[PDB]
Amino acid sequence: GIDPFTQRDVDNALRAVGDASKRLLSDLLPPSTGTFQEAQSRLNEAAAGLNQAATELVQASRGTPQDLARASGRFGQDFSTFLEAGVEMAGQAPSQEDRAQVVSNLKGISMSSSKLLLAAKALSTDPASPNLKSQLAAAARAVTDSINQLITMCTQQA
């Protein structure tokens, strides 16, 4: 056997995040009709987990590439659930101006999460680069920022 789950997870994350970001923010839209607050709540629950997923990349970046693997594997996977909920409520937006706006926010976190993963991947091949830890933490902070940004907007913002 070979060394399992160390490089797969960092690519698998891009697989999940990338596909979700491309298939949901383009072409395919969740035709889920019902209560807006349901998708709102569903997004909130999902976000809370993804917030930790980004945190996992942070804690793992200062540990081992093998931790980064599981951090990557969850981050990409959980992002799907987050995005699928976000795009769902985005499609329920009555005004297309707001609809396009919320999609723009979704892109912000979709891109940032992708950009974060790239740092984790690089840190798996370059684990002796201390600066790359901080770059990862910075990108993770950006992801978490975008998550909270969208979550603040999904609720009635005052």
UniProtKB/Swiss-Prot annotation:
Stated role: High molecular weight cytoskeletal protein concentrated at regions of cell-matrix and cell-cell contacts. Involved in connections of major cytoskeletal structures to the plasma membrane. With KANK1 co-organize the assembly of cortical microtubule stabilizing complexes (CMSCs) positioned to control microtubule-actin crosstalk at focal adhesions (FAs) rims.
UniProt-annotated location(s): Cell projection, Ruffle membrane; Cytoplasm, Cytoskeleton; Cell surface; Cell junction, Focal adhesion
Protein name (database record): Talin-1
Phosphothreonine sites (modified residues): T64
Free-text note regarding domains: Consists of an N-terminal FERM domain linked via a short unstructured region to a large flexible C-terminal rod which contains 13 amphipathic helical bundles (R1-R13). The rod begins with a five-helix bundle (R1) followed by three four-helix bundles (R2-R4). These are followed by a series of eight five-helix bundles (R5-R7 and R9-R13) in which the N- and C-termini are positioned at opposite ends of the bundle, creating a linear chain. The four-helix bundle R8 does not disrupt the chain because it is inserted into a loop in the R7 five-helix bundle.
Shown chain mapped onto the complete sequence: 1206 to 1357 of 2541
Region listing for Helical bundle R6, in residue ranges: 8-158
Modified residues (Phosphoserine): S26, S124, S129
Subunit structure: Part of a complex composed of THSD1, PTK2/FAK1, TLN1 and VCL. Interacts with THSD1; this promotes interaction with PTK2/FAK1 and VCL. Interacts with NRAP and LAYN. Interacts with SYNM. Interacts with ITGB1; the interaction is prevented by competitive binding of ITGB1BP1. Binds with high affinity to VCL and with low affinity to integrins. Interacts with APBB1IP; this inhibits VCL binding. Interacts with PTK2/FAK1. Interacts with PIP5K1C. Interacts with F-actin. Interacts with SVEP1.
